[PDB]
Amino acid sequence: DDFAKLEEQFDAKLGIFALDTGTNRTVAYRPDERFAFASTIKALTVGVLLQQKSIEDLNQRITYTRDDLVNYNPITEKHVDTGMTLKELADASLRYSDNAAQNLILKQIGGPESLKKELRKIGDEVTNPERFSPELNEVNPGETQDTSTARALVTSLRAFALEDKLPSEKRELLIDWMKRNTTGDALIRAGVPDGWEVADKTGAASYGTRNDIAIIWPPKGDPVVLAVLSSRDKKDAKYDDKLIAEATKVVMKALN
Amino acid sequence: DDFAKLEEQFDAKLGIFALDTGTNRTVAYRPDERFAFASTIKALTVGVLLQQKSIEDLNQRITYTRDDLVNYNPITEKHVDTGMTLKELADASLRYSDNAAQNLILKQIGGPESLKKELRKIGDEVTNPERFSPELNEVNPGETQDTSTARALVTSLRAFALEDKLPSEKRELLIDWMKRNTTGDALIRAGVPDGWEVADKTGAASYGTRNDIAIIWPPKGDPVVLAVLSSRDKKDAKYDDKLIAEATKVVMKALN
Numbered sequence: 011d012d013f014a015k016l017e018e019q020f021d022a023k024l025g026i027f028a029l030d031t032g033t034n035r036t037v038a039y040r041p042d043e044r045f046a047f048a049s050t051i052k053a054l055t056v057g058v059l060l061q062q063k064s065i066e067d068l069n070q071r072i073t074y075t076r077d078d079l080v081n082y083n084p085i086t087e088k089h090v091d092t093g094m095t096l097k098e099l100a101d102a103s104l105r106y107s108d109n110a111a112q113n114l115i116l117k118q119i120g121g122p123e124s125l126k127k128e129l130r131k132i133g134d135e136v137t138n139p140e141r142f143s144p145e146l147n148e149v150n151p152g153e154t155q156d157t158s159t160a161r162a163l164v165t166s167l168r169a170f171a172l173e174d175k176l177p178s179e180k181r182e183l184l185i186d187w188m189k190r191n192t193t194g195d196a197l198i199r200a201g202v203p204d205g206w207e208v209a210d211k212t213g214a215a216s217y218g219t220r221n222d223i224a225i226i227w228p229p230k231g232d233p234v235v236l237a238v239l240s241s242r243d244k245k246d247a248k249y250d251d252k253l254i255a256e257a258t259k260v261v262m263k264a265l266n
Numbered sequence: 267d268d269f270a271k272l273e274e275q276f277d278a279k280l281g282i283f284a285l286d287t288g289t290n291r292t293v294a295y296r297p298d299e300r301f302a303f304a305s306t307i308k309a310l311t312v313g314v315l316l317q318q319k320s321i322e323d324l325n326q327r328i329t330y331t332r333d334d335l336v337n338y339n340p341i342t343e344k345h346v347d348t349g350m351t352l353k354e355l356a357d358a359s360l361r362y363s364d365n366a367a368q369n370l371i372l373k374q375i376g377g378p379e380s381l382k383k384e385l386r387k388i389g390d391e392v393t394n395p396e397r398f399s400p401e402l403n404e405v406n407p408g409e410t411q412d413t414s415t416a417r418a419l420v421t422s423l424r425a426f427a428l429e430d431k432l433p434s435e436k437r438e439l440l441i442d443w444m445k446r447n448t449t450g451d452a453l454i455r456a457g458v459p460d461g462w463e464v465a466d467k468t469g470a471a472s473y474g475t476r477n478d479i480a481i482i483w484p485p486k487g488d489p490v491v492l493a494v495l496s497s498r499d500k501k502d503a504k505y506d507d508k509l510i511a512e513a514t515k516v517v518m519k520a521l522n
């Protein structure tokens with residue numbers, strides 16, 4: 011098997027779950043193994059924001075300070091003095107993985123405990139939001155805080171984006187943001203054919219953790235929802251995006 | 267000088283114009299020399315399309331056939347049966363240099379002659395659109411059909427993207443498409459420090475024409491708008507992307 015091969019080549023542990031939503035055919039490799047979710051949680055976070063606010067209510071302007079900035083603030087560092095709307099925050103979070111934008115959205119929805127509550131509510135008993143960004147990235151093997159599984163992430167992302175945990179106008183918003191991600195070009199998008207539309211959200215964390223969760227659209231036909239998660243044994247390990255890209259190619263062969 | 271040295275190293279002719287939009291300082295080398303503009307005209311074409319349609323009007327669906335497909339159709343070739351909206355065509359044209367998409371868009375704006383008129387309307391007397399793609403790439407030395415100059419391409423791209431030929435929300439679309447370009451990793455982007463956002467559109471044509479036009483946002487400060495054009499003296503000449511990355515490094519140093 012080809013996932014074992016990738017684990018060998020990249021000295022890494024892979025967690026994979028893919029659902030072809032046309033057929034309910036499934037492709038799994040350690041699907042229930044826990045990983046740090048890292049920034050993939052931002053996608054679920056916006057999902058819950060969208061349930062809680064009208065589209066029009068996303069125009070509320072949030073004021074913040076240098077105190078709200080954390081380790082990686084690519085958009086949010088430009089607008090300290092003008093503020094950013096909730097819509098703009100969602101954009102930055104999803105398209106740039108802006109960690110302060112995440113923390114700002116999370117405060118707006120009642121924090122990690124409230125996010126977890128709302129995840130439970132949608133049927134997700136696995137994903138365990140506990141901390142703010144980037145502390146949520148510090149996860150040691152065996153620990154369950156700020157972890158989820160490939161299967162749980164898939165099921166949750168499908169629920170917000172494709173089923174009925176959002177109305178269609180808000181599903182369109184989330185999908186547009188994730189289609190237009192800037193962070194993902196070497197990962198899931200690198201293992202799909204050009205012309206197959208991809209909406210994704212990436213993550214990186216401790217233990218060489220390197221994740222991507224995606225909706226993938228064939229030219230016609232129903233979408234595939236995929237989570238490709240990875241980690242490595244040393245705390246300070248590097249990751250290699252090619253792993254996720256190669257793993258994606260294996261998934262697409264097994265389903266097609 | 268250093269641009270000289272790059273023509274020597276790569277046996278090529280270079281056309282450079284850069285404008286630092288903050289200071290109005292300029293870097294030029296053969297800035298008014300004509301080159302085939304090749305696929306860089308796609309960016310201007312979207313500019314015109316945006317100007318002439320409401321954002322909502324981009325949702326118009328275009329039906330097309332195999333007869334609309336030409337030499338290079340990475341996205342359009344997948345969607346003959348479903349059609350594509352003008353929006354999707356603008357994404358295909360800009361981020362993948364989909365030649366069929368450019369042609370479909372050119373038709374909806376009234377063709378090459380009509381694109382010429384509109385570019386004259388925005389103040390560009392230099393750029394000479396005359397053909398559809400890929401014919402526009404066949405330019406022999408000394409001809410003026412489907413050529414422009416680095417200066418004119420900088421001037422025109424700035425007009426659309428940064429100035430007042432478009433309202434901001436349309437400016438945002440054009441810019442985000444070009445930032446997420448897939449074709450340019452080895453040209454201007456390879457001459458710019460990682461992390462600085464880069465919007466660009468590439469081209470390649472006969473006589474080893476190899477072009478890239480870009481907006482570059484330095485970490486803070488106003489943007490630079492840059493054209494690097496290049497061509498060689500044999501019709502079947504190969505180009506080398508490294509020429510454009512190296513020319514770009516030169517401009518960055520001349521401006522700091």
Ligand SMILES: *C(=O)[C@@H](NC(=O)Cc1cccs1)[C@@H]1NC(C(=O)O)=C(C)CS1
Nearest residue numbers: 048049082107144147193212213214215
């Ligand atoms: C989420 O995964 C985020 N990661 C972290 O904050 C931990 C790190 C910062 C620097 C290196 S690890 C952000 N998201 C992304 C991404 O989605 O790709 C990256 C790469 C770093 S910040």
Ligand SMILES: *C(=O)[C@@H](NC(=O)Cc1cccs1)[C@@H]1NC(C(=O)O)=C(C)CS1
Nearest residue numbers: 304305338363400403449468469470471
């Ligand atoms: C525009 O430049 C396009 N060029 C062509 O269709 C003519 C060709 C030259 C070589 C092969 S076909 C498209 N854009 C690009 C590009 O911008 O990089 C390329 C590489 C070819 S198709």
